[PDB]
């Protein structure tokens, strides 16, 4: 991604987030102060990346994030106090998102973007490569299990684990499903 929508009601966090992003080569293409505007802007203008607070006026960050996630249009990072992180973990049934605990610096933000992007690539790949929804729902579960095994048994980060699956499937000229099934067979 390069083009970012930010949604944050606290002016200082918003300004600091914007500056962080600019310094690391992003362009800020939209700024919202509430969840309703965040949804409207994202759906109208299709940014590359959305970063939104979990708590926001009008439409809560989580509800907005779920809606945007459901449309499969962009990776989403949801900013949260440590104690509120479970709100995001619950919401991932809707699609690809990652939380980022506040307060945060760029060294925290960059890995959170990497994670949100990886998850978005996974949902995008599942939507495209798996024919039917009933298959897709179970293929998502399978790929998540295979990722887990690569993380725990081979020490990979979550994004590197999914990248491994995609690169294996591409190079071996097969599917994510088959690669994931073989990971389960081997490491499970």
For residues 35 and 64, is the Cβ–Cβ distance under 8 A?
Answer: yes
Closest C-alpha to 165, from 107, 124, 122, 120: 122
CATH architecture of 131-188: Orthogonal Bundle (1.10)
On whether the CB atoms of residues 22 and 108 are closer than 8 A, the answer is no
Q: Spell out where the chain is interrupted, by the residue before each break (C to N > 2.5 A).
A: none
Determine the Cα–Cα distance for residues 78 and 73; give it in Å rounded to an integer.
Answer: 15
Method for structure elucidation: X-ray
The ranges assigned to domains in the chain are 1-130, 131-188
Sign of CA dihedral 77, 82, 84, 86: positive
Secondary structure (3-state) at 63: helix
Share in percent of the chain as helix, strand, coil (round to 5) = 65, 15, 20
For residue 27, the cross-strand partners are 3
CATH code of the domain made up of 1-130: 3.40.50.2300
Q: In which element (H, E) is residue 28 found? A: strand 27-32
Secondary structure element (H or E) that encloses residue 77, with its range: strand 76-81
Interacting residues of 25 by C-beta distance below 8 A, sequence separation 6+: 2
Q: Do the domains 1-130 and 131-188 sit in the same CATH topology, yes or no?
A: no
User: Could you tell me which residues are beta bridge partners of residue 188?
Assistant: none
Closest CA to 36 of 9, 64, 62: 64
Token pair for 41:
């802007």
């Amino acid at each position: 991604p390069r083009r970012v929508l930010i949604a944050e009601d606290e002016a200082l966090i918003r300004m600091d987030l914007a500056e962080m992003l600019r310094e690391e080569g992003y362009e800020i293409v939209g700024e919202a102060g509430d969840g309703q505007e965040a949804v409207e802007l994202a759906e109208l203008h299709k940014p590359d990346l959305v970063i939104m607070d979990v708590k926001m006026p009008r439409r809560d960050g989580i509800d907005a994030a779920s809606e945007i996630a459901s449309k499969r249009i962009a990776p989403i990072v949801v900013l949260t106090a440590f104690s509120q992180r479970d709100l995001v973990e619950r919401a991932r049934d809707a699609g690809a998102m990652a939380y980022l605990v506040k307060p945060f610096s760029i060294s925290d933000l960059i890995p959170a973007i990497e994670l949100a992007v990886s998850r978005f690539r996974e949902i995008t790949a599942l939507e495209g490569e798996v024919a039917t929804l009933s298959e897709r729902l179970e293929t998502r579960k399978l790929v998540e299990r295979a990722k887990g095994l690569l993380q725990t048994k081979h020490g990979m980060t979550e994004p590197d684990a999914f990248k491994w699956i995609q690169r294996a499937a591409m190079d071996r000229r097969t599917t994510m499903k088959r690669v994931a099934e073989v990971v389960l067979e081997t490491l499970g």
